[PDB]
Ligand binder design. Structure first.
Ligand SMILES: NC(=O)c1ccc[n+]([C@@H]2O[C@H](COP(=O)([O-])OP(=O)(O)OC[C@H]3O[C@@H](n4cnc5c(N)ncnc54)[C@H](OP(=O)(O)O)[C@@H]3O)[C@@H](O)[C@H]2O)c1
Ligand SMILES: NC(=O)c1ccc[n+]([C@@H]2O[C@H](COP(=O)([O-])OP(=O)(O)OC[C@H]3O[C@@H](n4cnc5c(N)ncnc54)[C@H](OP(=O)(O)O)[C@@H]3O)[C@@H](O)[C@H]2O)c1
Lengths: 112, 326, 112, 326
C-alpha cells in the first residue's frame, strides 16, 4: 500500500507499491532496478523520457497484462519504451500480435 | 579502515564505536567507574555517547550529564544521543505523542545538564500516535534547538520509510539513522531491510548489543559468573535465555569462533565487534562495559577489522549458520 | 545532470540540463538565450505559449533528432513553435520532408 | 561611480570596499592598530567588515568584537560577516553539518559579542555534508536571529546553484552572495562562472585578495621585505610562490602595469583594487592592511575607478595576458 511517485519528464504519476510489485520482473517492479532513478529529495522516481507513452505502461500494472499503445503515440516510440521499462518478452509479443504482426544442398537452395 | 564515518548520509561525524550507558551508568557500576570509562573512551577518540530516559529512571543521564560537566569537555566535540519513550508511570508519559516527545526530551536535557542532544531517538515504534504527529514533534524539537538530528530505534523499514515519506509530504526533517540490534546471533534486520534504506533514503544504522549483552564474549560457557549481566537483579530474563537449551548451542558455536579469534591474534569480543563494523550500513557500534578492562579490550576491535577477509567472514557465516536469505 | 524545470503556460516539464545542452544551437540549449525566460522565484523557465506542442519539442532533445508533430496539434501551429524554440534549419526541413513537402530573353520567357 | 551597492540582488547595502581581519587582526598587527584601521575605515564610509572563526583561532573576532563595543558604533550601521568551517581540532568541529554550522556560528557570535552577524558564510564547500542539511542549517540560524543572510565562499557555480535549487525545493532561504578570489592574476572564476549566477539567481560576489596578499602591490620585486606578509611565520607558502620562477614573471608584468598607475595618477595597489570593482558582479572588495598608510592608500582606489576606460582595461588585459576564454 506504500505510495510510489513516478516523475516522467515533469508529468506526475502515483500508484501503490503493490501494483508495481505485481510484476517483479520489470524495471519498476524490481526495487534494485528502479533504485538508480530515485530522488531522495522529492521521494519519487524520475525518468527523462517520453510522456504520452507512460499512460499505458502504468496501466499495464493496474490492469495486470493489458498493453495498448495510445492512439497519439507513434508505433516505434511506444515499442522502444516497452524495452526500457522491461515489461517482458511475453507482453511484447502480445503487443505485436495485438497490433498486427505474426552444405551440399544449402547453396543450390539459395539460387532457386 | 577509516575511524570516523558519517552517520548515514548526514554530515554528523561519529566514531565507528561508542559508549552506551545502559545497565551500567547509574545502575550496575558506580559513578566513579562511569567517569573512568568515558574518560578512557573520550581520550581514545570516541565521541558518540548514547543514553535514554528509561535507563535507571533517568539516573544514567544524570551520571552522563555530570561526567561531561565535570571533565569540562567541549560540547562541540561530543555526540550525545538520548532515546525518548518510557518517561514515567503515567499514561501521558510514554509513547511518541507530541506531548511526551517534547516533555521527555526537555526532561532528558535537564538531567543531562545540556542545552541539546545531538540526536534524539524514538526508542521503539508507537502505534498509538500518528506518524505525522511524531514527525512534526521531532521536527519541532530540532528547530527549537533541543536536538541537531533525530532517528528511530526498533522501527521496521516500513515504519522508517513512512517517517521519511511523511517528512517529505509536510516539508519536515526526515530521520537520519536507525538503532537496531546486531550481533553474531541477530543479523536479519541490519543485513536485509536496512541496507535498502541506506541507499534509497540514506538512513544509517547505529547497531546495539554487538556481544548480545555479553553472551558472545563467551563468559557463560560454564555457568552464570557472579557480578555478571545475567546475575544482576531484574535480568533473570537474560539468565533464562543463557541457561536455556537454545542458549547452550550458541555457546557451542563460540568454541569454533574462539579458534578464529586466536588465529587472527585477537579476543572473541574483538572479533564480534569488528564483525559488526564490516558493513557499510553500520555507521557505529554502541559498546557496553562494566570496567576499564572490558572497554579497552572492545576498542581493540578496530585492529581486527582489516583481518576480516571474505575467507574469515564466510567461515564465520558457516559456523553460525544463520546468514539471512536475501 | 542539473535538473531544469520548464513551465509551458502552466504545464510542467522537467529534464536534465545535459539533454538540452545536447543541441547547443537552439533556445533551450543556449543558456544566454533561455536566460530571459527564467523565474528566480520558482527556479523554472516559463513560456506563455502553446501547450500540446511542447511534448514533441522536449522529446526532440531526449530522442536527439526525432521531431514528430502530435496528431492533435495543427500543422501550422506546431511549425510556428519550431521557429520559436529555434530547433534549426536542418530539423525543420526534415520535419517538412517527413510530413510530405519537397534580360534579352528573360521577358520572352515570361509570356511563354 | 556609486559607492554603496547592493550585495547581489538582496537589499543589503554594502560599501564597494571592506576591511578584512585575516592575518592582521589578533595576529600580525597589534590590537591597537586594528582599532585604528577600523576607525579609519568606518569614518571613511566602509560598513562591511569581514572575519572568520579560523583567523587566529577566533582571536580575530575577539579583536573585531572589542573594537565594535569599544567604539560604541550603532549595530544597525555595521555589516559584520563571519565564515564557518574550521571551528576546532575535533572531528565534529569542522565542515558544514547542521551541528557545526549552529555551534560554530553561536561560538563566533560569542567572541564577537554580537547577537547576530549580518551574513554568515561557508568558508569552503564541504563534500561530507548533504546540501539539504547545509541549506536547512543556514536557513535555521537566519530564522533564529543569528544571521540576516548567508552566502558561500570557494564554492563552484554548480555548488552555489544547487544550494539555490535546494532552497527553492524546501521553501528555504537561498544564498545571496559568493566570496571568490579575484586579483590581476586570479580572474577565471569571477569573470566567467559567477556573472551567469548574478543574472540567473542574482548571487553577488564579494571578492577577496585584490592584491594577491600584497604581491600585486609590487613590494616583492627585490626580495622578501621584513615585516611583510611573506616573512611572517606560517606563510612560507607565500614566500615560496613569490620567489618561485612563476612568481617572478608576475613581478615583471607589474613594471608594465606600474607605468599605467603613474600615467593615471595613482599607485599600483589603487589600480588593481579599482580594476576589481570594474565588474557588475563584484558587489564589494575586501581590503587587507597592516598599517594606516596602506589602508588609506587602498581606499583611494575609488578615484581610479572612473579613470579605468576600455583603453586602459584592454591595455592591462594585454600586459597580463590571462583574459579567460568565455
Ligand atoms: N535501541 C535500544 O533501545 C538499545 C538497546 C540495547 C542497547 N542499546 C545501546 O547499546 C549499549 C550497550 O549495549 P549492550 O550492553 O547490549 O552491549 P553488548 O556488547 O551487547 O553487551 C555489553 C555487556 O557485555 C559485558 N561486557 C562488557 N565489556 C566486555 C568485555 N570487554 N569483555 C567481555 N564482556 C564484556 C558487560 O556485562 P557485565 O556487566 O556482565 O560485564 C556489558 O554490560 C547501551 O548503552 C545502549 O546505548 C540500545
Ligand atoms: N574567502 C576566504 O576564505 C578569504 C580568503 C582570503 C581573504 N579573505 C578576505 O580578504 C581579506 C583580506 O585579504 P588579503 O589579505 O588577501 O588582501 P590583499 O589585498 O590580497 O592582501 C593584503 C595584504 O597586502 C599588504 N598590504 C596591505 N595594504 C597595503 C598597501 N596599502 N600597499 C601595499 N601592500 C599592502 C598587507 O600585507 P603586509 O602584512 O605584508 O603589509 C596585507 O596583509 C581578509 O580579511 C578576508 O576577509 C577571504
Amino acid at each position: 500500500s506504500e505510495r510510489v511517485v513516478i516523475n516522467i519528464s515533469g508529468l506526475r504519476f502515483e500508484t501503490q507499491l503493490k501494483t508495481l510489485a505485481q510484476f517483479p520482473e520489470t524495471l519498476l517492479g524490481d526495487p534494485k532496478k528502479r533504485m538508480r532513478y530515485f530522488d531522495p529529495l522529492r521521494n519519487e522516481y524520475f525518468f527523462d523520457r517520453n510522456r504520452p507513452s507512460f499512460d499505458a505502461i502504468l496501466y499495464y500494472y493496474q490492469s495486470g497484462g493489458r498493453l495498448r499503445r495510445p492512439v497519439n503515440v507513434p508505433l516505434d516510440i511506444f515499442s522502444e519504451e516497452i524495452r526500457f521499462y522491461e515489461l517482458g518478452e511475453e507482453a511484447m509479443e502480445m503487443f505485436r500480435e495485438d497490433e498486427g504482426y505474426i552444405e551440399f544442398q544449402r547453396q543450390v537452395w539459395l539460387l532457386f | 579502515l577509516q575511524f570516523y564515518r558519517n552517520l548515514g548520509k548526514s554530515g554528523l561525524r561519529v566514531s565507528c564505536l561508542g559508549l552506551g550507558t545502559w545497565v551500567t551508568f547509574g545502575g550496575q557500576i558506580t559513578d566513579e567507574m562511569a567517569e573512568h570509562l568515558m574518560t578512557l573512551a573520550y581520550d581514545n577518540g570516541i565521541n558518540l555517547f548514547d543514553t535514554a530516559e528509561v535507563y535507571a529512571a533517568g539516573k544514567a543521564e544524570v551520571v552522563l550529564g555530570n561526567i561531561i560537566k565535570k571533565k569540562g569537555w567541549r560540547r562541540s566535540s561530543l555526540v550525545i544521543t538520548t532515546k525518548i519513550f518510557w518517561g514515567g508511570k503515567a499514561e501521558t508519559e510514554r509513547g511518541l505523542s507530541r506531548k511526551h516527545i517534547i516533555e521527555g526530551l526537555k526532561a532528558s536535557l535537564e538531567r543531562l545538564q545540556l542545552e541539546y542532544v545531538d540526536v534524539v531517538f524514538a526508542n521503539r515504534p508507537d502505534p498509538n500516535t500518528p506518524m505525522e504527529e511524531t514527525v512534526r514533534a521531532m521536527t519541532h524539537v530540532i528547530n527549537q534547538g533541543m536536538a541537531m538530528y533525530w532517528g528511530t530505534s526498533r522501527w521496521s523499514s516500513m515504519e522508517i520509510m513512512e517517517a521519511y515519506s511523511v517528512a517529505r509530504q509536510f516539508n519536515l526533517i526526515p530521520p537520519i539513522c536507525e538503532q537496531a540490534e546486531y550481533h553474531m546471533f541477530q543479523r536479519e534486520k541490519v543485513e536485509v531491510q536496512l541496507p535498502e534504506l541506506f541507499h534509497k533514503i540514506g538512513v544509517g544504522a547505529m547497531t546495539w548489543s554487538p556481544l548480545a549483552c555479553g553472551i558472545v564474549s563467551g563468559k557463560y560457557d560454564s555457568g552464570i559468573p557472579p557480578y555478571s549481566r545475567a546475575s544482576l537483579k531484574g535480568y533473570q530474563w537474560l539468565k533464562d535465555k543463557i541457561l536455556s537449551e537454545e542458549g547452550r548451542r550458541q555457546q557451542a558455536k563460540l568454541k569454533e569462533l574462539q579458534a578464529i579469534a586466536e588465529r587472527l591474534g585477537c579476543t572473541l569480543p574483538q572479533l564480534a565487534i569488528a564483525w559488526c563494523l564490516r558493513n557499510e550500513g553500520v555507521s557505529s557500534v554502541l559498546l557496553g562495559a562494566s570496567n576499564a578492562e572490558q572497554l579497552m579490550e572492545n576498542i581493540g576491535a578496530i585492529q581486527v577489522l582489516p583481518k576480516l577477509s571474505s575467507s574469515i567472514v564466510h567461515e564465520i557465516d558457516s559456523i553460525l549458520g544463520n546468514k539471512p536469505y536475501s
